[PDB]
Amino acid sequence: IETD
Amino acid sequence: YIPDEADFLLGMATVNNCVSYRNPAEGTWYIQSLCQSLRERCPRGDDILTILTEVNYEVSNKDDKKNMGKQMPQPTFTLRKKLVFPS
Amino acid sequence: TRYIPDEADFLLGMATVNNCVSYRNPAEGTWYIQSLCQSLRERCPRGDDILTILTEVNYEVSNKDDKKNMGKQMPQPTFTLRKKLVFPSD
Amino acid sequence: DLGKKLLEAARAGRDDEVRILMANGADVNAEDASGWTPLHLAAFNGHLEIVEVLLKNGADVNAVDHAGMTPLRLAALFGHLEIVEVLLKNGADVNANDMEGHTPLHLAAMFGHLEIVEVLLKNGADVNAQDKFGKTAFDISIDNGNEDLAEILQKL
Amino acid sequence: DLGKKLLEAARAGRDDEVRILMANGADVNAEDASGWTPLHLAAFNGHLEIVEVLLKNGADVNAVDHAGMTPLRLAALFGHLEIVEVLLKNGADVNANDMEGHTPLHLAAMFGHLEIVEVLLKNGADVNAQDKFGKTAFDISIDNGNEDLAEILQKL
Amino acid sequence: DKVYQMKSKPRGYCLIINNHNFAKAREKVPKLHSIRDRNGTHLDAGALTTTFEELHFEIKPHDDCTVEQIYEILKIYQLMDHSNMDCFICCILSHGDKGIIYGTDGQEAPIYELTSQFTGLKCPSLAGKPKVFFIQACQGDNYQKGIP
């Protein structure tokens, strides 16, 4: 999962 | 006459100061939930605030376990009417 | 026990969008609150949720104007409500 | 749980439930999740009769909740003069410090509760008590524009 | 009104309707409330055939909408190369400045539309044309990280 | 679909910070020298009281709170155990500016500072429960323009  | 800033809906993926999450394999928590909700609820005649509430609910249930992270979308609106997206 | 965002379940009913005045009639109350209360009193008994209500408030307050200053008022709810907010009787 | 019921009854100002609950052995010093005792709750919500009943039933007049607050702090803050008096009459520490080192006098002063300030002073409130920010009740009354109150404190 | 039908047909990309409306006298230079002509709408929405038919039917190729924009600006902005070419072939003003002093070259450069930029340049686009920021297409291409484009403009 | 449980008696507190008197502001804060009292605010406080009392909230009105008082009051609500409450409502009727409401002393309370006092972390007993803040205040001096 990645963050914007 | 209605206010200049009436009839806005701002669907923020996250409250201020915080990350919103993007799964490279699935898209973002927020947008995916939103679309899911829209697709599921618009035909039911659910209005966007109800949908965004569901989005809030859905996204709120997601976890970035690594960072014990959550994401709290936050709609803001000056909608004066129910916003529905009918057929 | 599930975990929800620290900032979940908030409803912020702003009488006005940022940068702008909200109106108060010394003889009636503020557009927003009076509209809000009227709408709550009218709609809560019908089971309307707060966002529907605040939408009506937006509508009602949006229809009001400060003729002197061609003033309008745009209340602006912000929410992290994860559920319908109703205020049922009982 | 009788304590919880008592907490809510006290909180809710349900005198008869309180009396009934404590006739039924309810822990007069039950603490809710915030360390509030029924006395805190009653003090906070201005339920004098309940405060009286709780105190008569051995309520810890100096119960400190999780935030370091006493029923007196609450009574003083929220301007419940009679409750302040009853608390004080029942041995409330008039100078109990909360976590900011505010005594009830600080709070009463902060909230411009002149009669409570008077009662507190009359009950030995340390007028020079400085909170953890070095502020006296007087300083707090000034910061909060309670001049009529500042006058009293200032002269102390 | 036919003009509104035509505007919508042009916007919608309904070539046959556009053709039919114009056959029925539709004002090929109808303007919507934003001064957009069918040509703008077609250029905007990348409807080449409609651009062509409108042009063939005397659409003002340099119709300026209320915001001072020409179809070519829109075509350039939105990367509609063929429309750009068609517009230019039909006398589109390569030097049309919008309210920002942006020529279509600026927009093309801004949006990294290399072929469009090349076409505009081919068609007399002022490579040294500055906008209201004094920026050339080159500067804009740098600003917008359009390296290949900037490289070409740079040689100029 | 999902609806916040709203059946506790009371539903929760409806804290009303009802700021009418801005003498302190006018005295203490130069730029608020002209800030006017909020005449008619009692009608809001009253309507909110009537409305929310009717909706079974326990109305906790506080008139003319300085920012510090607002904070101290809110702190109690932040600190207290809302376990038996289904909801917390806080109405601030005050003057305000961008993102803030004014204490009667003309000090600023960032709305977010106020609301954030009731996050799940700050107020676990309200976690999962609707925390409603109605802010009746200006958020600036601009007159929202009208559109036909």
Added chain:
Amino acid sequence: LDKVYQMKSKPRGYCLIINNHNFAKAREKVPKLHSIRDRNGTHLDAGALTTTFEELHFEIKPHDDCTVEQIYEILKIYQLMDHSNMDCFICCILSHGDKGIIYGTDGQEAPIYELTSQFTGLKCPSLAGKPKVFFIQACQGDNYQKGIPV
């Protein structure tokens, strides 16, 4: 009953999708964004938005990897154009962001308010009285929203 926005026009309106994936420019151009990552997966959002809003009869208007200037320019078109025949305008921004802003792929900042304010009744009268919806999929900072048990 609340009034309901008219939502019957075909299309309902434009659903602009600013889909920012490539932040190479940001990484190159903005020191504090030197390590800002490309937004892999954003295409899926764009697709989801596209299909969802097509279903809702919006004309989807995707723009990928927009620098801030490009965003403003695109938005300007939508701000300026005549939405009279539209019942709604939707703008989705998928990008990185920070408090109150979204990033162009160039790492420039576009305050969300700056974006949404382009569509006020004054800015865009043809949308006056019509829902203007902005979905902003961006971070609004780098804080992890904490979770609390319920």
